[PDB]
Design an enzyme around this catalytic site. Structure first.
Site, short mmCIF file in Angstrom:
data_model
loop_
_atom_site.label_atom_id
_atom_site.label_comp_id
_atom_site.label_asym_id
_atom_site.label_seq_id
_atom_site.Cartn_x
_atom_site.Cartn_y
_atom_site.Cartn_z
N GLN A 1 0.81 -1.21 0.00
CA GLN A 1 0.00 0.00 0.00
C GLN A 1 0.84 1.27 0.00
O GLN A 1 0.34 2.34 -0.35
CB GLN A 1 -0.97 -0.01 1.19
CG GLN A 1 -0.33 -0.08 2.57
CD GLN A 1 0.12 1.26 3.12
OE1 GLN A 1 -0.45 2.30 2.80
NE2 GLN A 1 1.13 1.24 3.99
N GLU B 1 -4.65 -4.73 2.16
CA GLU B 1 -5.73 -4.02 2.84
C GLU B 1 -6.68 -3.46 1.80
O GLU B 1 -6.24 -2.73 0.90
CB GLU B 1 -5.17 -2.91 3.72
CG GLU B 1 -4.15 -3.38 4.73
CD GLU B 1 -2.73 -3.31 4.19
OE1 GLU B 1 -2.53 -3.56 2.99
OE2 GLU B 1 -1.81 -3.02 4.98
N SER C 1 9.14 -1.78 -0.98
CA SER C 1 9.82 -1.00 0.04
C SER C 1 10.48 -1.94 1.04
O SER C 1 9.97 -3.02 1.32
CB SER C 1 8.85 -0.06 0.76
OG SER C 1 8.05 -0.76 1.69
N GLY D 1 5.13 -2.73 5.60
CA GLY D 1 4.17 -3.44 6.41
C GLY D 1 3.58 -4.58 5.61
O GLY D 1 3.30 -5.66 6.15
N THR D 2 3.39 -4.35 4.31
CA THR D 2 3.05 -5.44 3.39
C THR D 2 4.10 -5.63 2.30
O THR D 2 4.24 -6.73 1.77
CB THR D 2 1.68 -5.21 2.75
OG1 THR D 2 1.76 -4.13 1.82
CG2 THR D 2 0.64 -4.89 3.80
N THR E 1 9.63 5.46 10.91
CA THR E 1 8.20 5.30 11.10
C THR E 1 7.84 4.02 11.82
O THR E 1 6.71 3.89 12.31
CB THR E 1 7.47 5.35 9.75
OG1 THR E 1 7.89 4.24 8.95
CG2 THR E 1 7.79 6.64 9.02
N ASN F 1 13.06 9.66 0.92
CA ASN F 1 12.09 10.74 0.80
C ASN F 1 12.58 12.06 1.38
O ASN F 1 12.21 13.12 0.88
CB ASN F 1 10.78 10.34 1.49
CG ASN F 1 10.99 9.94 2.94
OD1 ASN F 1 11.97 9.29 3.28
ND2 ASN F 1 10.06 10.34 3.80
N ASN G 1 5.51 11.58 -5.72
CA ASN G 1 5.37 10.44 -6.63
C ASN G 1 5.62 10.85 -8.08
O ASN G 1 6.14 10.06 -8.87
CB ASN G 1 3.99 9.81 -6.47
CG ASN G 1 3.68 9.44 -5.03
OD1 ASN G 1 4.58 9.36 -4.19
ND2 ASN G 1 2.41 9.21 -4.74
N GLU H 1 21.80 -3.87 -21.14
CA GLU H 1 23.02 -3.07 -21.11
C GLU H 1 23.24 -2.46 -19.73
O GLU H 1 24.37 -2.43 -19.23
CB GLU H 1 22.96 -1.96 -22.17
CG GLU H 1 23.03 -2.42 -23.63
CD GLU H 1 21.89 -3.33 -24.05
OE1 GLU H 1 20.87 -3.38 -23.34
OE2 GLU H 1 22.01 -3.98 -25.11
N1 GTP Z 1 6.08 3.93 -1.30
C1 GTP Z 1 5.49 4.81 -0.50
N2 GTP Z 1 5.87 4.92 0.82
C2 GTP Z 1 5.26 5.81 1.63
C3 GTP Z 1 4.25 6.64 1.18
N3 GTP Z 1 3.86 7.42 2.23
C4 GTP Z 1 4.61 7.08 3.32
N4 GTP Z 1 5.48 6.08 2.95
C5 GTP Z 1 6.49 5.37 3.76
O1 GTP Z 1 6.40 3.99 3.44
C6 GTP Z 1 6.26 3.17 4.58
C7 GTP Z 1 5.12 2.17 4.39
O2 GTP Z 1 5.49 0.85 4.75
P1 GTP Z 1 4.38 -0.18 5.31
O3 GTP Z 1 3.64 0.51 6.43
O4 GTP Z 1 5.02 -1.45 5.80
O5 GTP Z 1 3.39 -0.47 4.07
P2 GTP Z 1 2.63 -1.87 3.80
O6 GTP Z 1 3.49 -3.09 4.03
O7 GTP Z 1 2.14 -1.89 2.37
O8 GTP Z 1 1.36 -1.95 4.80
P3 GTP Z 1 0.85 -0.75 5.74
O9 GTP Z 1 1.42 -0.91 7.14
O10 GTP Z 1 -0.65 -0.80 5.87
O11 GTP Z 1 1.22 0.57 5.10
C8 GTP Z 1 5.94 4.10 5.74
O12 GTP Z 1 6.77 3.81 6.85
C9 GTP Z 1 6.22 5.51 5.25
O13 GTP Z 1 7.37 6.03 5.88
C10 GTP Z 1 3.86 6.53 -0.16
O14 GTP Z 1 2.97 7.21 -0.65
N5 GTP Z 1 4.49 5.61 -0.98
#
Ligand code: GTP
Ligand code: GTP
Ligand code: GTP
Lengths: 438, 427, 55, 438
Positions: D11, D71, D140, D144-145, D179, D206, D228, D254
């Site tokens: 997400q 989610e 990433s 979290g996911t 975070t 970021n 983005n 390449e």
């Molecule tokens: N790629 C991306 N990262 C973001 C954005 N906004 C904030 N972040 C950072 O990206 C991290 C998100 O990681 P996770 O929380 O593990 O995301 P996830 O595993 O998909 O699941 P969630 O916990 O619900 O978000 C956060 O700690 C933020 O610091 C965004 O718009 N895009």
């Protein structure tokens, strides 16, 4: 010429007659009255309808089907329904008494005095028609009225007419669902009586029709009509060869010859590949190659069988719509090269192809897709013995503890006929394995 | 065409049948006077299964009322629908009942059976082809048991080809009021078992518990109880009168419930029962109904089959529903409690779906039960019978009419046979 | 106390009910239905080269 | 032909997928409906979109990406957004349970039952395409996911498809902003799992993206929308070679061959020089010289790495727009003469030039500048070991006092895998200086 007669037995056999005939009337543009608009297609009754409908000098179509049942309820509501004005009043053969799920009740008690009447219909149907290729029989194995009454007539249709084909279709007993525990009893009572006469039986199962529906049609709450539209579409495709033409034209006689290997076993499986929701097909594309694999994916078969547990014998694909042999022949060349697909090595070739240019149309108020490349996949495999294996253990227990016979012996039978059919079945599995034995 | 003629017997069946017919009349839209107000074409068509046509669109009930006491009939006649009944079927005796089982079975019936036989055969010739007959009465009831046992015997030989639908109420196990009711019940059930084909068992205590449970109105009328039980009886009869993708014939049903001849006792089960505010607190969906219809608390016939197991279960579903939910519900309940069924028979469920909703609600159903819960019933009456036959209490009357104890001995053996007959099959 | 007694009337609710229940899937899709078990219960999409369970 | 598949897991990594696809439809002029104006571009799906979209005979461009999520909230709101009709429902792989930042929970508990469907999705995308150069994975490290689920699929797609490239794109963890404190836990776990399979992983931070915007873009309050689009532009520039042409055309292969020196380490850093506000670009001028100085200015990088603490190995500049080779080769020669720029003496040449004539455009309602000459600067240096040097002393303290371990071991895990990561990292740094050691 190229025409046939249809038979619908049992209130399980009649709604599908309503539904399918509701389908056929559409592509021909048949109005509820029976007559076309001011446009000219009427005459002595020789046009698109001449194989299905009898639009004689009166100018309105007469479907070549007979609806037979033993209760006046469902036949009157359709006699008061939408298309009753087309339909012939006493071709809608009704009954006043039910067989109560009992095969013999519909085979001995009331059948004698009413088959003569339907014999009058068929001959008055037979005399008028010219080509009379075969009969379209729709029924049910677990027939409260479908089982017993159909068995007697097909015997009488077999003995008087043994030179033409007869096409039977029944909903197969559900592998794990039983709305009746006398549905078992009549089932092999029907099958043992029919094995020595039937030409080719095609079966379906409701659960997997549903399992498809809430998989790719996305409808978690379908209607009872949707099943009928799907199976009605199924027979529409197999009759599209009859109605229209294509690259090659194939007839039921060819399907009879090229499908069934040997006597007794004549039980192949159908499957229609382009089953998808409209919004799914909305932004996706279909071609022959991927739908060829789709109809070969086991979960797309409406019969609860694992083909990996069996071996393939015959397969028939009918390509209705815009297709060309080039991508078809290359794609089917690939499927032969596949290794998971396990045909019997007796038949290097086991496929029957049918090309029809007509794109299958959408039913108004429908739920299906928008298909121009379609196929109904008729195939027979050795993975079917489990169903009868699923059966015989359901039976050996109940006959041993000897249930419900007081109903049956109460209205006049004995246990010998119930005995003979079990080795008739036992002959089938030993037949089914030995043909599987190479 | 196949029709039904009803028989109204006992002083309960008078109370039962009165509520039974008026519910049907209010369902079909006929005013109390009898001039049908045309509102539904389907009920216009298939009312002939029960009623015949009179002059001016009056639908004459084909039910026969039998009693001995005019006042009950007088109350029935003066009822809101006594006008729809005929003076013709008002057949009765000049005697005070005393509700001795023997006087009604040997003394009073003797000069009354002839007339009622003459009665029923006239309406029998009035219509063409029956499915059969149905009787409302009581097994512990005094006057109804004597008349019913006599008539069921006679109707057996003369039409042996129809339904012997018996509808009897089981008196309260804790108190029978009538102290000689256990004699009456033991006498009645003996000839019931071989003569009948179908029997519904009903108990007031469970019905009282229903008011305790969901009606929640403290003080009802027995007519309110009649209203509840009439709905159940109407629900099973909605099968025949209404169209739909369901098989209605009791023969289509009875062969499916009855594995062996001795099975005639069947237990009803009904669908959504609602309290004061929960009409607008309920989300009407099939899962809750299936949950509710399969509730031990929802049960009303005898007792909880929790002590035993389930032989055959059949439930008719009334409303605008579909085969998928019942199918997936059936898989759920099958996988929920497979062990509490018998390994003797799997797939012992028989489902019917009526597409025509009732008048007052859309989603409804009726259930009929065949389980091992009747042991507690006739075992109860066994100790009653043995204790009261231990010292032959209240017998000098029955010897007076010409009855002897050998009847009791061989009758009880028949019930004792059924005790093993039920037990051996399940236990 | 009008609501109380008219609620406190009779007995108080107790589950002698049949414990019927349906186990649900781990997916919201009205088409896919997979639980802790039976994880191979979903609509198979339409592959063009490799047939069903090629491996 | 020439195409690739995009993957957006997490997400966090989905709204970045939302922007880039939104950006991509712009230069192609794709209407949100999915059809062009009366100009003729539809067909079997063979034009500028054929590498990106799938505009088959249905006439609707279908992006070649899969959006996997755990989610339903974010995936449904975009499914109620603007381009949802374009997007395929079940490539928006919606989610039902969360990994709770736990890599292992996502890697084991739910990941098993979903990957097959994703495996079902990927082969359907893999089978339809022809060129299939590689995969575009957006994820990433602190997911979290993103963390757990990306690792399992890349393992599964590595074992079956090992002949194509694997392009990885993840936000590098903020060195001083956390975070989540479980973020270092999984982040090193992904690195040690991804070291032996991943082909090309590109990271970014970021904070420095935020550092840039109020330096030269002059916005003290940007948004993800601003964030983005920057990265969405970045991938647009690298994919511009794939769509457009120029003096010379270069490809990921390449890039793979020429950037990564040795196995294991394949971690270059990307940069884009002409980052400037519209008004600043308005009364100023852009040319190859200053942007070459700008892209080699230490503070213009999006990663907290100072080059003079490290040494360059790989460098590539991707000129998109109106540029001549004359000023380029002279400028890069002067760059070669530079003394502060300390390349590793092992490579006399370490630059990969990509020339594209198409001028990069602006986004409607955007905040970028109107650029004629642009360059994406993907490079590599030894100044990166400090980033993993920060993580280890971050992790080693946490592991010694074994905080939060009861969560991980509670759901079925142990310490050995946590142990392996530390020497995998310890192996990772010890390789970093020895290649730095000339
Ligand atoms: N790629 C991306 N990262 C973001 C954005 N906004 C904030 N972040 C950072 O990206 C991290 C998100 O990681 P996770 O929380 O593990 O995301 P996830 O595993 O998909 O699941 P969630 O916990 O619900 O978000 C956060 O700690 C933020 O610091 C965004 O718009 N895009
Ligand atoms: N082929 C087919 N089967 C149906 C249809 N509708 C319901 N069924 C199924 O088929 C079965 C019908 O079998 P039977 O009950 O023996 O029907 P019958 O022999 O015509 O006589 P009845 O018992 O009175 O209905 C039902 O249990 C349904 O599950 C239908 O329209 N066509
Ligand atoms: N009508 C009616 N009967 C009830 C009620 N409660 C219990 N009963 C019993 O239901 C039985 C059935 O009625 P009948 O069979 O007509 O009784 P009976 O033959 O006239 O003989 P007795 O029971 O001695 O009065 C009666 O015996 C009553 O004891 C009630 O509330 N109303």
């Amino acid at each position: 010429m190229r025409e046939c007669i249809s038979i619908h037995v049992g209130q399980a056999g009649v709604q599908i007659g309503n539904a399918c005939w509701e389908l056929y009337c559409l592509e021909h543009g048949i109005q509820p009255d029976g007559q076309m608009p001011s446009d000219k297609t009427i005459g002595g009754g020789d046009d698109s309808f001449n194989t299905f409908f009898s639009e004689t000098g009166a100018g309105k179509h007469v479907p070549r089907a007979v609806f037979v049942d033993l209760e006046p309820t469902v036949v009157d509501e359709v006699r008061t329904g939408t298309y009753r004005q087309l339909f012939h009043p006493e071709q809608l053969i009704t009954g006043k008494e039910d067989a109560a799920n009992n095969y013999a009740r519909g085979h001995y008690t009331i059948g004698k005095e009413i088959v003569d009447l339907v014999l009058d219909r068929i001959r008055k149907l037979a005399d008028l028609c010219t080509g009379l290729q075969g009969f379209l029989i729709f029924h049910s194995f677990g027939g409260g009225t479908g089982s017993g009454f159909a068995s007697l007539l097909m015997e009488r249709l077999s003995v008087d007419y043994g030179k033409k084909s007869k096409l039977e279709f029944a909903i197969y007993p559900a592998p794990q669902v039983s709305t009746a525990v006398v549905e078992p009893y009549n089932s092999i009572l029907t099958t043992h009586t029919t094995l020595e006469h039937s030409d080719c039986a095609f079966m379906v199962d409701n659960e997997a029709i549903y399992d498809i529906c809430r998989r790719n049609l996305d409808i978690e709450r379908p209607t009872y009509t949707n099943l009928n539209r799907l199976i009605g579409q199924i027979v529409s495709s197999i009759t599209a060869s009859l109605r229209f033409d294509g690259a090659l034209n194939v007839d039921l006689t060819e399907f009879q010859t090229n499908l069934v290997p040997y006597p007794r076993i004549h039980f192949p499986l159908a499957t229609y590949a382009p089953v998808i929701s409209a919004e799914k097909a909305y932004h996706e594309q279909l071609s022959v190659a991927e739908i060829t694999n789709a109809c070969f994916e086991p979960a797309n078969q409406m019969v609860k069988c694992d083909p990996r547990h069996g071996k393939y014998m015959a397969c028939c694909m009918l390509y209705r719509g815009d297709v060309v042999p080039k991508d078809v022949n290359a794609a089917i060349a690939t499927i032969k090269t596949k290794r998971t697909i396990q045909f019997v090595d007796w038949c290097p070739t086991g496929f029957k192809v049918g090309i029809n240019y007509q794109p299958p149309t959408v039913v108004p108020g429908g739920d299906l897709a928008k298909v121009q490349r379609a196929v109904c996949m008729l195939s027979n495999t050795t993975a079917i013995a489990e169903a009868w294996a699923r059966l015989d253990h359901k039976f050996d227990l109940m006959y041993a503890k000897r249930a419900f016979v007081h109903w049956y012996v109460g209205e006049g039978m004995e246990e010998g006929e119930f005995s003979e059919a079990r080795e008739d079945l036992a002959a089938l599995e030993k037949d089914y394995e030995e043909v599987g034995v190479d | 065409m196949r029709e039904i003629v009803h028989l109204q017997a006992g002083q309960c069946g008078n109370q039962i049948g009165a509520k039974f017919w008026e519910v049907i009349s209010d369902e079909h839209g006929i005013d109390p006077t009898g001039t049908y107000h045309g509102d539904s074409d389907l009920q216009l068509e298939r009312i002939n299964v029960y009623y015949n046509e009179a002059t001016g669109g009056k639908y004459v009930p084909r039910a026969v009322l039998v009693d001995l006491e005019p006042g009950t009939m007088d109350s029935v006649r003066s009822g809101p629908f006594g006008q729809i009944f005929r003076p013709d079927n008002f057949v009765f005796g000049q005697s005070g009942a005393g509700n001795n089982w023997a006087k009604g079975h040997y003394t009073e019936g003797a000069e009354l059976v002839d007339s009622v036989l003459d009665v029923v055969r006239k309406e029998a010739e009035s219509c063409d082809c029956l499915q059969g007959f149905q009787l409302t009465h009581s097994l512990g009831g005094g006057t109804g048991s004597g008349m019913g046992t006599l008539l069921i015997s006679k109707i057996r030989e003369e039409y042996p080809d129809r339904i012997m639908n018996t509808f009897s109420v089981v008196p309260s196990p804790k108190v029978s009021d009538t102290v000689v009711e256990p004699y009456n019940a033991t006498l009645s059930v003996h000839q019931l078992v071989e003569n009948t084909d179908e029997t519904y068992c009903i108990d007031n205590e469970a019905l009282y518990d229903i008011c305790f449970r969901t009606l929640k109105l403290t003080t009802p009328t027995y007519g309110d109880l009649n209203h509840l039980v009439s709905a159940t009886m109407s629900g099973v009869t909605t099968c025949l009168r209404f169209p739909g993708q369901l098989n209605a014939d009791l023969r289509k049903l009875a062969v499916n419930m009855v594995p062996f001849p001795r099975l005639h006792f069947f237990m009803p089960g009904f669908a959504p029962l609602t309290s004061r505010g929960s009409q607008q607190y309920r989300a009407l969906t099939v899962p809750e109904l299936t949950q509710q219809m399969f509730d031990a608390k929802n049960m009303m016939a005898a007792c909880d089959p929790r002590h035993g197991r389930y032989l055959t279960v059949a439930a008719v579903f009334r409303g605008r529903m579909s085969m998928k939910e019942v199918d997936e519900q059936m898989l759920n309940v099958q996988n929920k409690n497979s062990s509490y069924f018998v390994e003797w028979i799997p797939n012992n469920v028989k489902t019917a779906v009526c597409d025509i909703p009732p008048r007052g609600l859309k989603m409804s159903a009726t259930f009929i039960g065949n389980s091992t819960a009747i042991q507690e019933l006739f075992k109860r009456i066994s100790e009653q019978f043995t204790a009261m036959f231990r010292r032959k209490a209240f017998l000098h009357w029955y010897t007076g009419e010409g009855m002897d104890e050998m009847e009791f001995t061989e009758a009880e053996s028949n019930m004792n046979d059924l005790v093993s007959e039920y037990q051996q099959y399940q236990d | 106390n009008k609501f109380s007694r008219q609620h406190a009337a009779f007995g108080m609710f107790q589950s002698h009910n049949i414990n019927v229940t349906l186990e649900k899937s781990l997916v919201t899709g009205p088409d896919n239905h997979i639980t802790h078990y039976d994880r191979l219960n979903f609509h198979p999409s339409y592959n063009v080269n490799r047939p069903s369970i090629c491996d």
